[PDB]
Amino acid sequence: ATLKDQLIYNLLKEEQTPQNKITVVGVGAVGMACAISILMKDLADELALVDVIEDKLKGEMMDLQHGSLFLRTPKIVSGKDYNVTANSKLVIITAGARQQEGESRLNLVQRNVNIFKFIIPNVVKYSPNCKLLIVSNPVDILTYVAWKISGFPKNRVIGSGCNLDSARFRYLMGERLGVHPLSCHGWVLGEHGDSSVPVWSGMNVAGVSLKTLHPDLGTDKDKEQWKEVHKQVVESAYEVIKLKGYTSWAIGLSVADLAESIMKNLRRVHPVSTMIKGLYGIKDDVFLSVPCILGQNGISDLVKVTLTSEEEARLKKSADTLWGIQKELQFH
């Protein structure tokens, strides 16, 4: 006469093939920041955590599990084996190779490719219809890798791209103008990293172009040196790592926001990393960050931003560089 049976009359066996499942792969600082941000935004009804560090994984699962009372996400699960990711709508990849000391860039990427050779086909094995959000760096290359390896079409392979950079850019713009980042508008596009392009033309508060008001905006002869806002944006992770060891919170919140649009089919515009063969004269299979319309089918549409000859040329060289690295990769 077990106590559960005395208390509760069961009415229904049925399995629970879950309806709004998100999986996070990799439980480091970035991964778990993505996890807590997702849980606290009530975006998913089952969350799956996957890593190879078995004891650390289990710790992070239990710790979240213990906060269940303060959450609205009834099922939290974890494991090294990818069957715990089955039927995910969205799979967020934070996993990668850790940096070796004298290691060439290619080699770092190659070793990420070797890891993705194992992860990605396990992810598609269990969630054939999911969306892949790649966070792992270098993100515009690793999004190409997940694309190639998965074979998913381009709308369901998304890189976190410059989504965060644009966030930092707005924060900083805000703190100059004394106005909330929500009301300060501006776009960092192209390659996530040192070569990202701050589109000055597009910066506005309430539709009032900063570029028109201050024509020297973004340039050398700019006496307010607004390019330092960009320099800050690019330097930002470095300085944060220099200070606290890693970064986590910002990238967590940023990925949670991309998930919001996807999981709730919002059709919001985010600058994320997407295939752009065809656009800006770029002829290579290369992912770059461009404002995209995000929804239940991933990237459904993208926004053709008017770019200058100068800004177009930046994007083209980012692609040249990326391809140069991408064509020395080994997938077999």
Add this chain to the structure above:
Amino acid sequence: ATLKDQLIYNLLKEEQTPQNKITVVGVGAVGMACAISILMKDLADELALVDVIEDKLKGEMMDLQHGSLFLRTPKIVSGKDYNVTANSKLVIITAGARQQEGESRLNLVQRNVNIFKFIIPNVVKYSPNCKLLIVSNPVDILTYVAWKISGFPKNRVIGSGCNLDSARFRYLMGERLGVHPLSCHGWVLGEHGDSSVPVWSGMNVAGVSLKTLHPDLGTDKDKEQWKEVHKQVVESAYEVIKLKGYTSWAIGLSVADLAESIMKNLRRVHPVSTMIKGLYGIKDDVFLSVPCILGQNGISDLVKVTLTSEEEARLKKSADTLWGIQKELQFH
């Protein structure tokens, strides 16, 4: 004129006194997990971080700031100087001594005393009307310590106590019964730790006493061994720490929940650590966890839970140990 000034006409520069300020002291895993939990429950319009480790501190402030666009808490600040804590409604203390192994428990607590000797007066100096929430372990003792130093009335010196213990209990009650923990009710009370008391009489679902349904509940002769549920509660922070190195997420979510009741004046009942001289035949100046009505002035009232003789003894022995340590502390 500047760009700022061609774009924005200022009507009044005028001083901000902040209106719902929360300060968090100590930016290790526990402290930051409280800070992210609070940012995401929009409980505060200003969040101040304080620690002595300046690199870590600036790093965390910058990282949170960088996700501002995704938050509705417009000012985040930090510093080693408690002037940044000014006019806080609530001050959460996670700071403490690093354990030294060898160390007697007494000496460990005395070093915490000496830290609080510096911290607590600075806090009250800058936010004389705040509520203090102590999270630092050993929490039932350190809440007494903060009270004796602050000279605040007991209603505004609150230990996080068995709030999380009780959430763990309910999560576990939950996975056994197949019901969300929000709907599983049971209270861990008394000393936060080994000696905590699981009040079986109070364990219910939909107001059905489990103890009346299965009288063996919480006894050696219990066939379903529900006593193991309490054992898992007692040992979770050990099991999680052993597995992932620290604990953070559950405590953060837990402490944000206390902060919600305080900041929004809800007068909900949480089991937190407070002065119980008088209750359950306790004669000494001891804090322990009892269900308390939390609101804008902190603890307004406490619930007189009926305990068995056995439970009342467990609790009294608890206060006797707590007093055995406290009577050996050095304040002046």
Add this chain to the structure above:
Amino acid sequence: ATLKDQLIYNLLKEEQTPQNKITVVGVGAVGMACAISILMKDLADELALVDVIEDKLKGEMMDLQHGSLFLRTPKIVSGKDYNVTANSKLVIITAGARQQEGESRLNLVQRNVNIFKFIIPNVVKYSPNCKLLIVSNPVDILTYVAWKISGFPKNRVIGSGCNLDSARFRYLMGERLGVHPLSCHGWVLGEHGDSSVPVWSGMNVAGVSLKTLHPDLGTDKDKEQWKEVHKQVVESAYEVIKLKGYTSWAIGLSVADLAESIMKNLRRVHPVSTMIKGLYGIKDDVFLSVPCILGQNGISDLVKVTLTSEEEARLKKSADTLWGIQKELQFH
């Protein structure tokens, strides 16, 4: 081409199929209150409204649409035709007959049945796998009716039952005690309306039985007349209606809560109207409120509250009243 085509490049013209769609039938005060509350708890990616009064339905739909910028439900539709309700996960029925002075209680029910005879098969035509949440009054009878007409299994046909009854009961308990209704616990069960049963035995705060503490709780020799609290609960709708005309807000919030559990698979326990044939010595196909576990499959399990024979007699009496009314109803 056009502006849209110049701005936005399209990767993908899109299947549709909304993933978390909710339909509200009837756009009176109760329906719109349910709708606004659902929209503000970010529970659905598509909201569909259905009434017979065309101008009203379109005006409300437009009004909601114009707040789209402050919400997160990208698609809001309406129509006379149930084709706007396709692929709903939850269809919430508020529709019913307007009372006519001097009409018997039976003819009122029948007229409601003639409506359901049109509505229910349309709801299943287009959402064969939805859950039905009936709100229309009399709720326990009209739940049975929807159950019969739909042919759905019983787990997927739910009446709002004594859900709000117990909210009001908790609110009142709260005023008396000085404590948020969240921390006061009490269940009103059975037939929604004059014969509902306040289960004194289960009333607690912090898991302390008010009944044990105050043995006369709920009797006529009760010095504190706690019996009045239930009478307040039973009579509140009348009293609000008398003051403002209808009730709307509290019912809407109570419906949004039940959707939250269903749409998010929470498995929280709510006192809702379900089929209790086989309990409390009841052999008739009858629906009454009893505490139920709500999830993505609707009512998966239910709680067996222990009732005193007085309490058990009221449920049995209601089961006879209801059936003697139901056996007279006309459908097939």
Add this chain to the structure above:
Amino acid sequence: ATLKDQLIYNLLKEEQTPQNKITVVGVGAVGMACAISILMKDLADELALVDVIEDKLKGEMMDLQHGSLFLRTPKIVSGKDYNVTANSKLVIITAGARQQEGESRLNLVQRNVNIFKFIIPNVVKYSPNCKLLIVSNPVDILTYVAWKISGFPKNRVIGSGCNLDSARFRYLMGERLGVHPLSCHGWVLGEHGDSSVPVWSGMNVAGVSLKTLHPDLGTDKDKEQWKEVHKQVVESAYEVIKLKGYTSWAIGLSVADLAESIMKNLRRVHPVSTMIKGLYGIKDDVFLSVPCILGQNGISDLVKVTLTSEEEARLKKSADTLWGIQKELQF
């Protein structure tokens, strides 16, 4: 020993002012839509309702209170007496007179003046440091009227103005583009209603300007007739009132949104009605919607939009019009 004696040990009370109190005046559809939206965005620890029908008031207070368990706002109060409003941080005024069939524009705003002479003094009496948010129409004038009667600094007297007009604009712009309104940007400014101004130059998505991409946009010759997006915004309340009797939900959300900025000090930029004597030729004490920075002190700063001479003219004509009415008023 009561039950309460047996169950609750009580501690020495300390006193309690409410910390984030919002008052809403007038509990027709618009008042209550504002009330439920504020309740559901956890913006206050206390909500006060005030009107003149005691029955409707007590009913809406009870019906709300009954859903307390599902909310995080622990005190809801109502009454004809303005002391239920004491210590409000923000007072939202939806009260006013319905224009009657045979009634001029001058007598309407004069009746509203007289009603405001009763309400506003009472509001400042019990809550002298509040921000007033005027929602009542004709709003750009009544905002001016609240200002005059309260004697508040211009920063604490805010009119809802084109905050909803802009949101409707963005919804409609959204429908055409297949993009959510959050990501669609366009601003409606000036006198609320038929004479509002849609700033076509500022319309964008991800910072790509629509007017540069499609120079006819908003002119008549425009083959896609984008001008009708604004015309729709102008005739939306009319079209909805026609269809359901009134407008409530949209305005309610719009107002909560302004309330979120004020109550949480966000310094977000909302097109709201403010005293813009000094800009655009305007040399009169007139309130029109400009984009404004809203925080805890109300309107701290404002954005100087670059306007066409034609857009400038519409504002200036509005300002004349309004002063032409305000000068006949008597306080």
